[PDB]
């Protein structure tokens, strides 16, 4: 009885709900911003990719990122910046057999998962304008209350 799946859309996630995205494919999985101090994008790289340059459109703008993933797992790079004049930088990585990606607004912070399945964990970026963060998803997603975060963490790590 999952709350979803919902099709790709731009929306403003409410505080204290996990958005859990079920990416089947490579490319941008999600991007979000409050236009002040957060811009984030999660980029998907398929298994067994040797080093190459690839293009991604972030907030309507083309960016070249060199990628690599010699794992049998999928790789999700979290790209980040805290100013509109700065370039995106690689902040964190989630290496996943499940292909599920999470984002949550809670407690003054923006949360994602990083590390490697089945031991992926949450970490944050800080913002002074949390409520104004909107996201665009590029794949189906589900919505899971923070009160059920252990269930979300299980899905991230072991699959729907
Ligand atoms: C350890 C833990 O529970 N971690 C959670 C994570 O919790 C996020 C919150 O971390 C707080 O600090 C912990 C819980 C301590 N009690 C503490 O006070 O240090 C943050 N407190 C800070 C930064 O001082 C808290 O932030 C506050 O939240 C309240 C209401 O939630 C209010 O918004 C305040 O303005 C704000 O300062 C949280 O950031 O949550 C993640 C995501 O669910 C879990 O994965 C993780 O396990």
Residue numbers in the entry: 64 to 223
From the paper:
Rotaviruses (RVs) are a major cause of severe gastroenteritis in children under the age of 5, causing 200,000 deathsand account for 2 million childhood hospital admissions with an estimated cost of over 1 billion US dollars per year. It has been shown that RV attachment to cell surface carbohydrates, mediated by the VP8* domain of the spike protein VP4, is a required first step of an effective infection. Similar to other known VP8* structures, PVP8*s adopted a classical galectin-like fold with two twisted antiparallel β-sheets consisting of strands A, L, C, D, G, H and M, B, I, J, K, respectively. The structural data showed that the P VP8* uses a completely new binding site that is different from the one of other RVs and this single binding site is able to interact with either type I HBGA pentasaccharide Lacto-N-fucopentaose I (LNFP I) or mucin core 2 glycan with a similar binding mode. The common shallow cleft between the two β-sheets where the glycan-binding sites of other known RVs are located is wide in P similar to the P and P /P VP8*s but wider than the P /P and P VP8*s. It was noted that the P glycan binding site is located away from the cleft and thus represents a completely new glycan binding site, consistent with our previous observations based on NMR and mutagenesis studies.
The crystal structures of P VP8* in complex with LNFP I and mucin core 2 were solved at 1.94 Å and 1.90 Å, respectively. P VP8* binds mucin core 2 using the same binding site through an almost identical conformation as that of bind LNFP I, with a RMSD 0.118 Å for the alpha carbon backbone atoms. Two amino acids, T184 and T216, which are involved in binding to LNFP I, did not participate in binding to the shorter mucin core 2 trisaccharide. The GalNAc (GalNAc-I) forms hydrogen bonds with G171 and R172, while the Gal (Gal-II) makes hydrophobic interactions with G170 and G171. The amino acid residue of threonine that links to GalNAc-I pointed into the solvent. Interestingly, the GlcNAc (GlcNAc-III) inserted into the same deep binding pocket that binds the GlcNAc-III of LNFP I. It was noted that H169 contributed to the mucin core 2 binding interaction with GlcNAc-III, but this interaction was not seen with GlcNAc of LNFP I. The GlcNAc-III was further stabilized by two amino acids (T185, R209) through hydrogen bonding interactions. Finally, it was noticed that there is a slightly shifted orientation of the GlcNAc-containing motif inside the binding pocket between mucin core 2 and the type 1 HBGAs, leading to a significant orientation shift of the backbones between mucin core 2 and type 1 HBGA within the binding cleft. This indicated a mechanism for how P VP8* is able to achieve a broader binding specificity to the extended molecules of the two glycan types.
